[PDB]
């Protein structure tokens, strides 16, 4: 839910980039796609750039950004990629303010 500090609901790529504009390395948010409803993305700041990653759902319903690492819930995915980058440009560190 939008109860989580890292979850920002429907936010466009462009709006996500401006949200991270005053963040630092590891600043991130999870959002819903405005153009593909039902789809979720992670936007992550690293070295003066913003990296956008689609969150995939496998047929068993597990969530992942890296095929090797699949989780039951978005919160487990975030916790995991906060611990180890594991295919991301860097670890998820600071959720954009809410």
């Amino acid at each position: 839910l939008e109860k989580h500090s890292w979850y920002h609901g429907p936010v466009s790529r462009n709006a996500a980039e401006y949200l991270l504009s005053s963040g630092i390395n590891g600043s991130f948010l999870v959002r819903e796609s405005e153009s593909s409803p039902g789809q979720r993305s992670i936007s992550l700041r690293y070295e003066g750039r913003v990296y956008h990653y689609r969150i995939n759902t496998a047929s068993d319903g597990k969530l992942y950004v890296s095929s090797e690492s699949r989780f039951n819930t978005l919160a487990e995915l975030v916790h995991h990629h906060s611990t180890v980058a594991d295919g991301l440009i860097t670890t998820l560190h600071y959720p954009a303010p809410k």
Partner: protein, 103 residues
């Protein structure tokens, strides 16, 4: 107090660095500065011992202050800061810090 010896109010580890009639800015710069790898803070505030709604918001772990706005002037609020060093589902930290204050 007891027993011939002293009693003090519990002190706060929070500082109020800015105040207007409807808002307060709090700083934890001198406490979660020591406790580290903070990912984010959750700040909660409501009228002290009120029936009132308890409001909450979150800011990134590298922030040292947050503004609390939309307050009633001259009414006591209890403001509590929770530091989260992990996103593990269902984790809650051991020792939040708080302050009672009014504008």
């Amino acid at each position: 107090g007891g027993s011939g010896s002293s009693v003090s109010s519990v002190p706060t580890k929070l500082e109020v660095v800015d105040a207007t009639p409807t808002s307060l800015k709090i700083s934890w710069d001198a406490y979660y500065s020591s406790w580290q790898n903070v990912k984010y803070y959750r700040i909660t505030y409501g009228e002290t011992g009120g029936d009132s709604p308890v409001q909450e918001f979150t800011v990134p772990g590298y922030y040292s202050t947050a503004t609390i706005s939309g307050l009633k002037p001259g009414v006591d609020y209890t403001i509590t800061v929770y530091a989260y060093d992990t996103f593990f589902p269902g984790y809650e930290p051991n020792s939040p810090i708080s302050i009672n204050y009014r504008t």
